[PDB]
Design a protein around this ligand. Structure first.
Ligand code: HEC
Ligand code: HEC
Ligand code: HEC
Ligand code: HEC
Ligand code: HEC
Ligand code: HEC
Ligand code: FES
Ligand code: FES
Lengths: 181, 235, 423, 423, 235, 181
């Protein structure tokens, strides 16, 4: 029939056109040489808890450091007052106060926070890498580019750096792994 | 006969056990001299070929050589996102990333690995440091084996690669006679994967497109026959 | 006669306010309802094929350029990034690479259709000139493009097809260096070629613009030596929908075959050696540039002073016209004479469907083309040299002498009237 | 009336055999001897300036692309290769970079000339639409281009002007990723931008094709609210040679100033921070994208819920229309309303040379444009926030309400007849 | 006064003795920490700047650090065709290739090198490892020197670079008082060269073009005045 | 005058147009980052005549080796017969026979040839680098890629390599230098 045949030819042409167009819009999406980059895992695997752990990602280092009790108590004993940046830059949660309870990290899929802290090892002043291993005038990190003193939990202190060390979105992989991204 | 592979045709999406066997051989034999830079380590999980377990991929990656860095010179952990290593010189060979296309391809590798027999009865002494292959055609030949105008009387020529395998070089976990021929077939398929990983998608696209275009063409033929009817009816 | 039927913009207020920009007037009156004869066979489709193929190539290229990196150290790697990581990858590359093949195949049939049915004869000279100009542009384009993968054949094809320009005396090396960006091939050549390769297609489209403008002003050729009899023309049905649908049907078939190739026989028309990186220190055997340049490659490497019909020993009268220059002139002339044809055929007649001797000579010409294609791949050792010389000689003979003699003594046929051929 | 004077092809045999391809007919009859009024001031030149600038940019770019390498690791190095080794180098780059500035400066005067002399008023809507389309294309082009040097400002400008697309809800992040080639900026974005940046100019030329086709079919505005009185038209001298020469004189002056800049003040309009390589880990102070986007940047970063005239607290009625989305809509509307103008001015009148209130409001509009330009560079601290809010509000007010009220009560002027104004 | 350079204007093609002095200074002082990768060594013979003797250029090149290779990893002899070395980290600074444009430019370098005076009477103790400058504006400031809202009360700030020169750090072969100020001016000019080597060609092109275009414009004005004469004569 | 003024304006426009066009055609010529490459000099400077000298150029090595008498006599005692390639690949001269008198090198600006020989260290088979320092079965060079034996003067022998080691265009710089290009 006139109507059926004509309309069906038009429909088939449209379908073929769309099947040809879609890839021209798909090629611009993430190629294979990039999809992997978004999800990167770090196998903690007995890092001798308490010293440090650094891994490359996105072109910047991601600091994964266990906690040393003295470092912890110094952290938990910091009232929000006299704290330059009280925003808890960590993006895995809202703008909740920069408190160690929220600022340390998720709890291994369990219930504890005062044992691990993974932040972005990038000084907020201009992007230098602070030196770790208990340094500075607050028992934390020290930036050698201009002299910015970080604290135990990574909150900025004693320098031009305006804000603390951000915390990327990360969750645990059941007690031995970290997911960065 | 010709020992056709699985993918040799309009179908044959890369029987994967064959590729896992080829991988067991490549990393334990060919990797000693050869490399595959054009091949990421994360492809051993992508569909189509060996759909191995990612964790094993990360382990096998960390267990390889050290690829230093691109920003800060420092020997890293050779993360999977990187590429397979590269063996370059001092008794080493080319890259096998796309050797299955730079030659019907895989049959060359099969009939090449297959064939390293002793020197024939024209030059039994042979050559020092070079070994004989039935199918390689781009190697030197002694003057004793050439004809009156430089052409060789041998089927193949002398290749710088030694015999890669003996009677039972490695064990297969699945359970299979690991003779030389099966290993050769398997590694040939693995290299063809390394070169054409997107084969099955190719075939499926070809099928879909052939179908849709045959449909469109039939409908257009009907439309043409119709429109041109009142002008081709009296004759 | 030549009914344009502008539509008078009487449809409605929309078609009346469009009196600001005429555009729809153009489309309707001219480029859709263009009276075309009824006597059209299946050889008048390949222009639609060429237009579609050009669009396809332009699109796929604009996509590839989003992942290709012009540099000696990152071209091959980028091509593999395409064929592996990108979503579609292999498709775009195979469609780009093979579609060039179809493009040239289709222009060959487009051109030889023309030589038969007197489409170069007056009053259709401008179309012919523009078509030869295009052919040149697209040859240069495909050449610039085969280089970008920085394989092994790329390097050496470029090397030789640039040494050509250097053969000539006085201004050869200067042009060679000005074209390669230096004494020999390197990244500079690559950048030039990429840019140029990414620019000419648009010039081609414009030239296609003039190509289409010409044969709309000048009536489409028809199987017969007759015109549409403008003076009302019961013949000459319109283009839309009849011929549009016919061409689209043929085009669907052609794309079907093309995609079957792309999906089952994609590496068939290629050279495997282009999958190994380049070594300026080692040359492979049988470079064999490509398949759409073998005719001229053979016409070039034929004249070598190795036959009793060797006109090089005679051209050596002037100490400047050596062999190389002679072959280069021979190739440029092989094309220039095809362009000059419409002023060589001294016949007040048309399509060879009514000129037998012309039929025989023309089929011999097609055979010569195929032979040249097959010979450019085989060595210059006996007997192929004699074959190439014979074929080139016949090409030149046809286009220079044969057509005049015919135009003189080639009218033993009753020409058909009444382009309305209701047989 | 509208004398085309096709020339009748009576010159000679050359002009008679050209009946195959009309081309010279087109040029002569239409695009050279196009009757233009006598009453033209010096504001009707900038179109020639724009055409020449476009040609200049296309040429210089085709040259640069022979040495630019799109990749994060080799872009800066290639730019320096250009400015140091290449023969002309600095010239091409400075002419390319600054000529963009002149291009946008010239379109600004081209557009504001239009708003005054009712060139958007009927029957000249299509020209306006096409011009806004172009403006969009060329903005996007310049943006894609500022990125290629892979300096420091490139990265962050791209970052923010792509986070815009991500502000919107539901389909923001998807579009962002599909445009950047990934979550953030990297080589993929660079390749896209290079390709795209090397392709749109041709679309612009075509659109310029339609731009020129339109105002040839529709008469050039003229200083007054009058037409060429077609019914023989002692007024309306032709284009060639009179106006051609006038425009070329002005163009020579403009190029003189432009080259003086290029040679003495070339790095003046630029941002020094674009001469330091990129660090995704460190952001400089005062990114200040450029100078031809500051108006819209300010209209964007003005609405922040920081004023008693803050309509964001009211738009928060719907929980989806947050601030960011509000600013993005405000910018898109700042342009869409300029495009809608010809259907907002409810006046059966023309050039504001006979509409005083319109003169005052229009000069206030020019001042607002300059102010917005000056404010996008200064921080969002008091008092600049109030200034930006006032300016954006006035822009929208003008284009939405002011023109209707005028069209209602804005005819205290004696309109001039006889476009032949022999005063 | 402002100690304008030679090139500061419509003329001033880079007085070359100044640049040779700056080169004596840069290779013996600034090179210890800084680099100029964006600068080929052969440019020390190209016209416009220091037109040194090529042989001395090859000598000075071979006397520099070892830039290994791009094809075969092996410490070469560092031929002039390569670029100046790069000092990257561990107490080192940025690249001075185009620092004369990333800031009126050279005046910044002059008034920066000039000025490292002792700590003021707000924080005489200063800082450990950081030294004070009166013109750098992108450095830290102690809280003792900041105002009530974070702004600094000092002219400059604290820079990580130490004082580069003393009263008479080096000798000039031509014969000239090598005080700190002259060395600063000279090195500033050298860096401006390293950034804009094609300055003089710029100026000459500008002159030629201004002239030719003024001529063309005058001729076009005459042509216009002529053509438009019979229409602008009665009024 | 009408004619003079009009034609002169046209001429000036043409001249300016050409002066503007030329650089658009000049920039494509050899840039500064390449002109230097064409001319490369090697300072021999007491290379302890007789062992070898290798230098990088054009991406390939250029062998400059002095002559050892035993190597020389073996060379000069090679009749053209039994010589695979008798073309003397050296491009500094015509296709003259591959003889040691023509095949060694120019004469320091003096008169002698049996003391220096600089050839392109690239095997004509497929472009490998033969090992020097008296190797192979002819007291010359040996290619390890496929086994091609070169002789003292560099002429190919005992292998698939079809032709000898080419000799680029080179002249001397007055007794201590070599010009390659
Ligand atoms: C060193 C001990 C090797 C190991 C183990 C393997 N290969 Fe190899 N291979 C090697 C060399 C030195 C060469 C060059 C040979 C020459 O004469 O140039 C090769 C070559 C190959 C090739 C290419 C053959 C060709 O036609 O050019 C292939 C396809 C190849 N080798 C395959 C291969 C495989 C599958 C291996 C593991 C089973 C393997 N080789 C091991 C050195 C060595
Ligand atoms: C190490 C002992 C140095 C030597 C010797 C010289 N410079 Fe340097 N410089 C050095 C560092 C660590 C820095 C960074 C300072 C900071 O606070 O970030 C610099 C910086 C500069 C700059 C840039 C200043 C700016 O505004 O960013 C310049 C222009 C500069 N230095 C110049 C310079 C000159 C001319 C030198 C030789 C006379 C020289 N420096 C030596 C480290 C060192
Ligand atoms: C927008 C860019 C663009 C356009 C337009 C374009 N191509 Fe290409 N072409 C490329 C790129 C990129 C490559 C390299 C990648 C590749 O080889 O597929 C290439 C490569 C090629 C190759 C070699 C293919 C291969 O894989 O070796 C050929 C042949 C070719 N082009 C011909 C053409 C012809 C003929 C046209 C039109 C007349 C054309 N191209 C249009 C971008 C383009
Ligand atoms: C060297 C010759 C030549 C080349 C190359 C050429 N053409 Fe043609 N073309 C012709 C001639 C001759 C005609 C016949 C015109 C007529 O019959 O009036 C023609 C006709 C056409 C037609 C209308 C009738 C037909 O044959 O389909 C189209 C459409 C067309 N060409 C498109 C193209 C396109 C698109 C290209 C290239 C991309 C191209 N042509 C290349 C010479 C050429
Ligand atoms: C044929 C290629 C091409 C064309 C056409 C082209 N450009 Fe570019 N453009 C480039 C290249 C290459 C660069 C990078 C080199 C540079 O910055 O000079 C660039 C950079 C730019 C820059 C940054 C300049 C700088 O130095 O940071 C701007 C702004 C720009 N383009 C705008 C435009 C505009 C606007 C147009 C036309 C509407 C245009 N370009 C036409 C090739 C082109
Ligand atoms: C958004 C508005 C707009 C933009 C952008 C624009 N145009 Fe126009 N253009 C106009 C209008 C309105 C007119 C007046 C037409 C008339 O008077 O009939 C005009 C007229 C012209 C004219 C003839 C009279 C004149 O003013 O010189 C030329 C030539 C021209 N435009 C060229 C260009 C070119 C080339 C570009 C860009 C590369 C451009 N225009 C961009 C709107 C625009
Ligand atoms: S960069 Fe980290 S403190 Fe200055
Ligand atoms: S490559 Fe030198 S002999 Fe095979």
């Amino acid at each position: 029939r006139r109507d059926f045949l004509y309309h069906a030819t038009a429909a088939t042409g449209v379908v073929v056109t769309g099947a040809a167009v879609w890839p021209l819009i798909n090629q611009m999406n993430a190629s294979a040489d990039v999809k992997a980059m978004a999800s990167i895992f770090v196998d903690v695997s007995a890092v001798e808890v308490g010293t440090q752990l650094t891994v490359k990602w996105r072109g910047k280092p991601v600091f994964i450091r266990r906690r040393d009790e003295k470092d912890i108590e110094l952290a938990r004993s910091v009232p929000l007052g006299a704290l330059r940046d009280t925003s808890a830059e960590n993006a895995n949660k809202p703008g909740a106060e920069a408190t160690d309870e929220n600022r340390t990290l998720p709890a291994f899929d369990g219930t504890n926070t005062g044992e691990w802290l993974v932040m972005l090892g990038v000084c907020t002043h201009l992007g230098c890498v602070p030196m770790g291993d208990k340094s500075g005038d607050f028992g934390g990190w020290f930036c050698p580019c201009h002299g910015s003193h970080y604290d135990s939990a990574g909150r900025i202190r004693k320098g031009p750096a305006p804000r603390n060390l951000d915390i990327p979105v990360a969750a645990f992989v059941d007690e031995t792994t970290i997911k960065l991204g | 006969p010709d020992h056709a592979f699985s993918f040799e045709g309009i179908f044959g999406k890369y029987d994967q056990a064959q590729l896992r066997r080829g991988f067991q051989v490549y990393n334990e034999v060919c990797s000693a001299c050869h490399g595959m830079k054009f091949v990421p380590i994360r492809t051993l999980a992508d569909d189509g070929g060996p759909q191995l377990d990612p964790t094993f991929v990360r382990e096998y990656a960390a267990g390889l050589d050290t690829i230093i860095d691109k920003d800060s010179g420092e020997e890293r952990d050779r993360k999977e996102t990187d590429m397979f290593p590269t063996r370059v010189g001092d008794g080493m060979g080319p890259d096998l990333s796309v050797m299955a296309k730079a030659r019907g391809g895989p049959e060359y590798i099969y009939n090449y690995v297959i064939g390293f027999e002793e020197n024939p009865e024209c030059a039994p002494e042979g050559i020092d440091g070079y070994y004989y292959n039935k199918t390689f055609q781009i190697g030197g030949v002694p003057d004793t084996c050439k004809d009156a105008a430089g052409v060789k009387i041998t089927h193949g020529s002398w290749a710088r690669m030694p015999p890669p395998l003996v009677d039972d070089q490695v064990t297969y976990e699945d359970g299979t006679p690991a003779t030389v021929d099966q290993m050769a077939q398997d590694v040939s398929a693995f290299l063809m994967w390394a070169a054409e990983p997107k084969l099955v998608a190719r075939k499926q696209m070809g099928l879909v497109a052939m179908v849709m275009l045959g449909l469109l063409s039939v409908m257009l033929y009907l439309t043409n026959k119709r429109l041109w009817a009142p002008y081709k009816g009296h004759k | 006669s030549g009914i344009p039927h502008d539509h008078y913009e009487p449809k409605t207020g929309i078609e009346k306010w469009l009196h600001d920009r005429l555009p729809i007037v153009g489309l309707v009156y001219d480029t859709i309802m263009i009276p075309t004869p009824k006597n059209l066979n299946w050889w008048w489709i390949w222009g639609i094929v060429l237009a579609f193929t050009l669009v396809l190539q332009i699109v796929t290229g604009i996509v590839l350029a989003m992942h290709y990196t012009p540099h000696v150290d990152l071209a091959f790697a980028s091509v593999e990034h395409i064929m592996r990581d990108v979503n579609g990858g292999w498709a775009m590359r195979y469609i780009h690479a093979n579609g060039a093949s179809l493009f040239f195949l289709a222009v060959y049939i487009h051109i030889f259709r023309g030589l038969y049915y007197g489409s170069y004869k007056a009053p259709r000279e401008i179309t012919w000139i523009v078509g030869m100009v295009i052919y040149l542009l697209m040859m240069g384009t495909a050449f610039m493009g085969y280089v970008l993968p920085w394989g092994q054949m790329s390097f050496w094809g470029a090397t030789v097809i640039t040494g050509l320009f250097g053969a000539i005396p006085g201004i050869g090396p200067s042009i060679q260096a000005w074209l390669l960006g230096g004494p020999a091939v390197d990244n500079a050549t690559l950048n030039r070629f990429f840019s140029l390769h990414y620019l000419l297609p648009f010039v081609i489209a414009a030239l296609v613009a003039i190509h289409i403008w010409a044969f709309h002003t000048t009536g489409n050729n028809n199987p017969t030596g007759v015109e549409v009899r403008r003076t009302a023309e019961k013949d000459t049905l319109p283009f839309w929908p009849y011929f549009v649908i016919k061409d689209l049907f043929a085009l669907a078939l052609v794309l079907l075959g093309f995609f079957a190739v792309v999906a089952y026989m994609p590496n068939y028309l290629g050279h495997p050696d282009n999958y190994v990186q380049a070594n300026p220190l080692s040359t492979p055997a049988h470079i064999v540039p490509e398949w759409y340049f073998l005719p001229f490659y053979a016409i070039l490497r034929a004249f070598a002073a190795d036959v009793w019909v060797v006109i090089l020993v005679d051209g050596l009268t002037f100490g400047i016209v050596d062999a190389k220059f002679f072959g280069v002139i021979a190739m440029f002339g092989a094309i220039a004479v095809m362009a000059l044809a419409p002023w060589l055929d001294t016949s007040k007649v048309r399509s060879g469907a009514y000129r037998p001797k012309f039929r025989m000579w023309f089929w011999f010409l097609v055979l010569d083309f195929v032979v040249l294609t097959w010979v450019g791949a085989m060595p210059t050792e006996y007997p192929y040299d004699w074959i190439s010389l014979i074929a080139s000689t016949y090409w030149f003979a046809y286009f220079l002498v044969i057509l005049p003699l015919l135009g003189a003594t080639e009218k033993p046929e009753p020409i058909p009237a009444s382009i309305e051929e209701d047989f």
